[model samples]
Target: MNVRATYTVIFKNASGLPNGYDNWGWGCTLSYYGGAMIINPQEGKYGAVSLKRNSGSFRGGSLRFDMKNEGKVKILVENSEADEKFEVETISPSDEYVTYILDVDFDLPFDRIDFQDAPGNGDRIWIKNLVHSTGSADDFVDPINLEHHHHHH
Candidate 1:
């Protein structure tokens, strides 16, 4: 097998969701605090955030992040062409931050990657230093930071 150099995709110290990412779901909220992305999913509600290519699709690589959770969370990959989705990982509660490195290999290249809270509510997760491999060194691009929206305390 031939080995190729991989480039890094950085998502650390971001003021808001970086370009090529979006958050959606019923009663799900996303915010930036202390350079981390906080995902709060309402109880008995569906909440999720996803990352995808701005133009084409992702090849295959690995995702790494610093996470702290109060309830269960999961990662999924979606292939638009195949109209299929697959669960990549499930993470239990953690009182403190834990570094997670998850492989994102699949039969075909995926279009989007999702992070969602597990079923049943009152769960929250914070993500920081989120990074991923580009599958190809030449394809790596810097993450564009977006302006943060002010929130009333």
Candidate 2:
């Protein structure tokens, strides 16, 4: 994974809901059941995550994630009129969490990216360390200062 430049901060569990996690931003919301954030799609609703863009254009990046789930998982990248999508490979199911790297592309600059999937009751899915990339996985690095964005309640 050769990378030219690295953008965005490393959103890790250690940071405890890393800065600019737009899971609940601008006409979107999800539930926090237990320790994991729950995305319950009710009444023809869909769970979504608007990835923190910080008001800039980014491309040729990927969303690296660690997840444990029961049903199908769909993490979509909301960019332009025609949105691009990435599907988690459930080829092999297990009790342990699986690691995946989804390659994404966008033509125009977007406010944020959306991530969604089947929201079973609670704990249907658990995700952490959702780091956004501007280059390759090899060039990914943890930000020295994690408090770029301040959130309350």
Candidate 3:
């Protein structure tokens, strides 16, 4: 398999202001050592390493990162509307970092994963490293291929 593309610090959401990632950027990013990756909640807002990885050859990898939940929540898959909750992992203490992995076939299962603090509302969350395959397969559908949109008025 070959590397399809590399998108560093890339976000489908605007990092500008008002309601962009600047307040709550969730995705993968390099650390001071360049060894560790950041995931979960973000700097200003809840952090999370959001990767739009969609490939086949690049199947199977690991997703490591730190997460901070100001509120209270656990690991669960979510969709566009932040509905359809699915269990992914568990949160500890109140604020801390955790590690998660996706075996080659980690299709995200649901639309979006909510590291939620509450049953709903998506009030708090923090993510760091988000590693995924960057290759393509017969049924490989890029994570970015999913329906995406940002409402700005």
Candidate 4:
């Protein structure tokens, strides 16, 4: 039997939070335009843009998104039920969009994910094409086409 499954788009140039996602962060401004979700940190204070599901959890998959930032940022994942957290560090290096396909192979399943500016690294970031899957990273495929032509025999 095939173990591969479909992916879900968490956000994609929408005016508000997409289905199954919620704004679970504070101290940041979130806006959508031009097919992107802009996250601006508050000055002199910590800020973050978080996405979480009201119920259920995610595991053994991949999180993919297009991101552009002005500086360093951290991706944090939390499994509240397990009281565990995982952090991933990333840098933009330039003000250009980069595609990130992060593996979600934590010891426990996560229900919340956050994007926050690193210490002394506060800056605006652009995000688009946020997607996730429950399938293993090894079975991960491009979500762009899968979103439309997923029907197969």
Better of 1 and 4 by TM-score: 4
Superposed on all Cα atoms, model 2 deviates from the true structure by an RMSD in Å of: 7.0
10 residues in a row with least lDDT, candidate 2: 85-94
* CA lDDT of every candidate: 0.71, 0.51, 0.37, 0.76
How high a TM-score does candidate 4 get?
Answer: 0.84
Q: Model 3 scores what on Cα lDDT?
A: 0.37
Ranking by TM-score: 4, 1, 2, 3
lDDT tens readout by residue for model 4, 1-153: 776676887876667777877888777888888878888888655688878788888775778788998867788888878778788446554588987888776778888888887653468888888878777656667666535356756
Error of 3 at 132 (Å): 4.2
Q: Summarize candidate 1's per-residue lDDT along 12-46 as a digit string, tens digits.
A: 76578777765434467788889888888777775
Candidate 2 stretches with Cα past 4 Å from truth are 1-3, 14-17, 24-36, 52-54, 80-94, 118-123, 137-153
- Residue 17 displacement (Å), model 4: 1.4
**TM-score for each of the candidates:** 0.77, 0.59, 0.35, 0.84
Q: Give the poorly placed runs of model 3, Cα more than 4 Å off.
A: 1-63, 79-84, 94-96, 102-109, 119-124, 132-153
- lDDT tens readout by residue for model 2, 54-126: 5454566666666665555556555433454434233233356766666665454444555554443222456
Q: Which of the numbered candidates is closest to the native, going by highest TM-score?
A: 4
